[PDB]
Symmetry: C2
Subunit: 211 residues, 2 copies
């Protein structure tokens, strides 16, 4: 949904990308927000650890704020591609519309757009689409990547290098569950099935394996 923080972060991202210094006055102007409101909002973002105001007053996005800012521009640009390539909305309206959509488009839709769209390297306005690497178009912890629904998936990593107990190593081996192997998953404990065999994992494995 629509976020002010997300709006400030994408503004800083833009200026930076344009080659303009992230000053509170340029942001305020771009955002069409008063000066006092921006320092008010920026003071909040600092406390959240999303931005830090440097000596020269310019705003430096922390790694966390930079990641968020980048997902917003990716969503934003992926949206524009959707609006021009498929929907066919008037090119003069595509940016305005995408400015709102960037706050409501989920990562799952982005991934789909990456599959559906012919080319995702640039927005219709000549700018590159950032964060695609991070979008995932390594993986997700089985614990937080599986639900009561026995969805399929693919092994990106097992992470047996970080395992202390190795008793289920052969289990995975028997059930032919390796890296790059599509497998099912249901969180009811985590039991990733494959090769017709179910594997009810232990805390640790569920924490390290990425699907």
């Amino acid at each position: 949904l629509v976020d002010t923080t997300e709006m400030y972060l994408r503004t800083i991202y833009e200026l930076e990308a344009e080659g303009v210094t992230p000053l509170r006055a340029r942001i305020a102007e771009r955002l069409e927000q008063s000066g006092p409101t921006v320092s008010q909002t920026v003071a909040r973002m600092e406390r959240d650890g999303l931005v830090v105001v440097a000596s020269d007053r310019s705003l430096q996005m922390t790694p966390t704020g930079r990641t968020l800012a980048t997902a917003v521009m990716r969503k934003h640009r992926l949206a524009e591609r959707l609006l021009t390539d498929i929907i066919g909305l008037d090119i003069n309206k595509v940016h305005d519309e995408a400015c709102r959509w960037e706050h409501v488009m989920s990562d799952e839709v982005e991934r789909r757009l990456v599959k559906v769209l012919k080319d995702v390297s640039r927005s219709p306005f000549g700018n590159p689409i950032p964060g695609l690497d991070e979008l995932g178009v390594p993986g997700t912890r089985v614990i937080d990547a599986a639900t009561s629904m026995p969805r399929k998936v693919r092994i990106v990593q097992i992470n047996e290098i970080f395992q202390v107990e190795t008793d289920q190593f052969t289990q995975l081996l028997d059930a032919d569950i390796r890296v790059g192997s599509e497998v099912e998953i249901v969180d009811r404990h985590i039991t990733l099935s494959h090769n017709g065999k179910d594997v009810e994992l232990l805390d640790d494995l569920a924490h390290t394996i990425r699907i």
Copy 2:
């Protein structure tokens, strides 16, 4: 963008459509909002002339609130059609996603979706898509339908029945500008061109003609 008013109105629309009485407790429940917050928000909507609480405490949307509620469900359902038919998002996520998109999708995009989608009669979940008539998929007053950009358009009505001064009647006739005739338009006064001839309209005509 995301509106609480729009959220309350679509909730009332749903219950009503389900055959449930628009009571503040069902809304609160559905919205997962406390009781006190809903009366707080509903008291606001009444003042806005969007809803009226009846004797039996149930909520009756005024014509204005009903129109708004309907556009939201239309946007919402048009969105779902876009998510399933084209984007291909997991069907179990389509409603959640559309719940957010309904607040950010403009009418212009809806019209496009109406052109692009194979069928807009029902949402993927079996419910009819309302308000298509009102979406416009009669017209828009040339005054508020033309800008500095000489966009094309189509005459839906001239409204000469409501004219007091009839001096430009023949002008329109000469320039072969009738109902169903595609014509250009630029608001810099309103001058709808057609048949290679420009017609700089007067206040009244600009107010009644719909493109």
